Design a binder for this molecule. Structure first.
Ligand SMILES: Cc1cc2nc3c(=O)[nH]c(=O)nc-3n(C[C@H](O)[C@H](O)[C@H](O)COP(=O)(O)OP(=O)(O)OC[C@H]3O[C@@H](n4cnc5c(N)ncnc54)[C@H](O)[C@@H]3O)c2cc1C
Ligand SMILES: Cc1cc2nc3c(=O)[nH]c(=O)nc-3n(C[C@H](O)[C@H](O)[C@H](O)COP(=O)(O)OP(=O)(O)OC[C@H]3O[C@@H](n4cnc5c(N)ncnc54)[C@H](O)[C@@H]3O)c2cc1C
Lengths: 273, 273
């Protein structure tokens, strides 16, 4: 199980449905005995812009500044900016991490994107030596709770926007899973601005209801790293044996690993595969 | 053709390859007679966080602030922050827009994501009435010039990060094409951190040579809006006739419109309708 949860909110208005979803989550969790911490990015006036100021000490190569290396070094020697360190301490303590935000330009709000860039620092959050399912957060579970302006049909296979599974991929696989998180099914709330007040009410109650057994859910399916040649002189490509065993299979493995074939239905939205 | 170009750069270091790429583009375009304008976000001390601070007038409703509606009203009544107005003026004049940036967490840097959120205001950059094909920037062309830490094989169909075409979709379709932009093939320079001094110089030269005829390039293929019933009533789904006639094709129309079938090879990387 997990007794600790962190809720990262990315919305400036306390009168928003997003703020209401954050409160709903914290209420349901505390009631079931969880310890709940929050990161209201707008409320904290969080700094989302990566810079050399994220390193407190003196740099290794100040004339040729490379963020990845200088930040990793700062993480190891203990001199990352203290606002960054405070967020990293919350992350370390949490078993479950909920990201509550409105979809903005088919992605995460800039302030949340900056939170990832500044907080998910090398070694602490990820290592090329232990990628994806073997990452640092492999004992943690993450969930995206998203609100949208567009309707669900707009995001279906035949909607103008296209499949929502493709939109979710960069985030759930590229950011969350890459660091080791077991990613749970996303809570998707479409066209919230066109939803009746009573439906909005049931949406909040259905979220609280889901959170009651969230930890026991089966996570989304991502191709295991055991299928890849985790080394540079190999190009981190799928192992030869694995490649063959797949050539006779109708479907691809995931949205990103579709292998030029059909992507299993709702790979990024529903768990079962 | 187009005589005016806007280069938006998102990198904090003047010593980076990204900065080098921007300087190469500027030089190359000016040489061929282009009028070049720049938006060096970091150097412009650019604010990427959307808030009610983006509106200078009175809010139509300060009780429950809703950014989409208020910013659209501000654009119409002329109440947008001076920095947004200046960027909108740059965009309005430009024929070609180049976005130069390093890949950060499978997406654009927070500062650039924020630039889109604050600059691409409704009415100005888009209208739900004239989405994609009929968007405001339909007479403009855009291009993404991206650098990455990971190698190309890592982003191939068998690479551990998965298909790069999926990563590029949210940006090129969801942001650029949605506003009307014709999107040209992206310039992708992989593992720039493991490329010899000799090889990087040719990259710069290769980029410069491409820009000499960039305007006469065949743009990437996105399903036309004519294939969809564009109304809340219809749910914005593909026209029935299209769905049927499409059922006999092997490949879907694009990454986002894969229709549960195979994704056309390099739909977001290579042009070929
Ligand atoms: C820059 C930008 C880019 C965007 N890009 C996209 C995009 O790419 N794709 C897309 O689909 N959408 C996009 N949107 C739209 C955005 O996704 C929606 O505006 C957002 O998800 C709406 O959520 P909200 O919390 O702001 O709700 P609000 O607009 O605040 O609305 C909440 C609604 O619920 C009511 N409410 C509030 N609290 C409660 C409560 N406790 N109980 C019951 N009812 C309550 C409110 O009165 C209101 O009717 C974009 C918006 C912006 C500003
Ligand atoms: C927060 C964050 C998240 C990231 N997420 C990802 C991700 O999801 N996927 C991924 O693949 N990568 C990721 N990266 C890595 C990032 O994409 C690379 O570090 C970046 O693209 C390198 O580009 P750069 O312009 O900074 O170059 P630099 O590291 O500066 O390197 C440029 C090289 O070219 C040399 N050079 C400079 N100017 C010139 C010139 N004029 N002519 C010739 N040579 C020159 C430099 O000295 C140096 O050796 C991430 C990095 C950060 C900080």
């Amino acid at each position: 199980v997990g007794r600790r949860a962190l809720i990262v909110l990315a919305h400036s208005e306390r009168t928003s449905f997003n703020y209401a979803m954050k409160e709903a989550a914290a209420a349901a969790l505390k009631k079931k005995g969880w310890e709940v911490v929050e990161s209201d990015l707008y409320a904290m006036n969080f700094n989302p812009i990566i810079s050399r100021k994220d390193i407190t000490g003196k740099l290794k190569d100040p004339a040729n500044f490379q963020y990845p290396a200088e930040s990793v070094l700062a993480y190891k020697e203990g001199h990352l900016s203290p606002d960054i360190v405070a967020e990293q301490k919350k992350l370390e303590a949490a078993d479950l991490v909920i990201f509550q935000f409105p979809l903005q330009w088919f992605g995460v709000p800039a302030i949340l994107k900056g939170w990832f860039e500044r907080v998910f620092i090398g070694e602490f959050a990820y290592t090329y030596a232990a990628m994806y399912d073997k990452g640092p957060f492999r004992s943690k579970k993450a969930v995206l709770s998203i609100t949208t302006g567009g309707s669900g049909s707009m995001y279906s296979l035949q909607g103008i926007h296209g499949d929502m599974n493709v939109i979710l991929w960069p985030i759930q696989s590229g950011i969350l899973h890459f660091c080791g998180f077991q990613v749970l099914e996303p809570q998707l709330t479409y066209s919230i601005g066109h939803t009746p007040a009573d439906a909005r009410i049931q949406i909040l109650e259905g979220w609280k209801k889901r959170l009651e057994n969230i930890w026991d859910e089966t996570p989304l399916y991502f191709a295991p790293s055991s299928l890849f040649d985790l080394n540079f002189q190999a190009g981190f490509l799928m192992k030869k044996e694995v490649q063959d065993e797949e050539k006779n299979k109708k479907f691809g493995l995931s949205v990103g690993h579709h292998l030029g074939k059909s992507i299993p239905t709702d790979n990024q939205i529903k768990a079962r595969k």
